[PDB]
Design a protein around this ligand. Structure first.
Ligand SMILES: [Mg+2]
Ligand SMILES: [Mg+2]
Lengths: 156, 156
């Protein structure tokens, strides 16, 4: 018997509880694909995760679907969007608001929401580009956190 | 009503405390690559995880390096090894004992240990096949959970 194993005995009851709660909200393994993270935003925002692959993310009770980006303010300063961006992708992203999650570690610090118009400045640009470069795709253009803090609504 | 959120806030301090525990043992994110699972193995077992290189996965305080393998008994039933198996990789293997972590969900279920002599059976079989196949790298052969249980010393 030692210090840590006592910490595992002590803490584990709650961890199993956190996982149970994660299953109810559709997340099998909190220790895998940032499940332990995606859940905070879900619980914090009353949203529901959509299966599929990597198209539309969450959806509320009203059925309004959402796009959902996450960032670790300790490591990055812009959100990923799509490594292969063309006018079809952009055509889809301009129909649903995006939920931006800002984590510092595994802990959530803030959450903003940009409406389709609030990202328009980026859509019309990434599109005018796709043409100029000669029908060439953009490799994961990034939206600056500064941009989202100044344009979106802070939900958390 | 805010049923589940209030719950999240209730469980989080222990989750955070659990994350701190993991960092001490060189795991930056519990919600990544089974961060919260490998920890159970490290605390119960007392092993230290070796960085990306150094081949072997863990070591103890005595300096004994080990090969650490894990599986979700819910999903798979045989531990993977190496996708490019060959006499050189096998040579790497014969040198150290293997720790076998059997997970059932986000929680360990049992932990076993094999001495090279115990995997001797599988190494020879592979080496021979690598050759009789005209020098071909065996694609990730596996070890049945039934074997490690019949032949290994249960540490947990
Ligand atoms: Mg998306
Ligand atoms: Mg290997």
């Amino acid at each position: 018997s030692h210090p840590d194993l006592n910490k595992l005995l002590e803490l584990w009851p709650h961890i199993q509880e956190y996982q149970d709660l994660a299953l109810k909200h559709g997340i099998n393994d909190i220790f895998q694909d940032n499940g332990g993270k995606l859940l905070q935003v879900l619980l914090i925002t009353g949203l529901t995760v959509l299966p599929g692959r990597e198209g539309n993310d969450a959806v509320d009770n009203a059925g309004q679907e959402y796009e959902l980006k996450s960032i670790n303010i300790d490591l990055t300063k812009g959100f990923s969007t799509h490594h292969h961006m063309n006018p079809v992708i952009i055509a889809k992203y301009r129909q649903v608001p995006w939920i931006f999650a800002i984590y510092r570690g595994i802990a959530i610090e803030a959450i903003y929401r940009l409406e389709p118009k609030d990202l328009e400045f980026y859509y019309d640009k990434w599109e005018r580009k796709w043409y100029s470069d000669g029908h060439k795709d953009i490799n994961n253009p990034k939206i600056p956190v500064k941009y989202v803090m100044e344009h979106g609504t802070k939900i958390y």
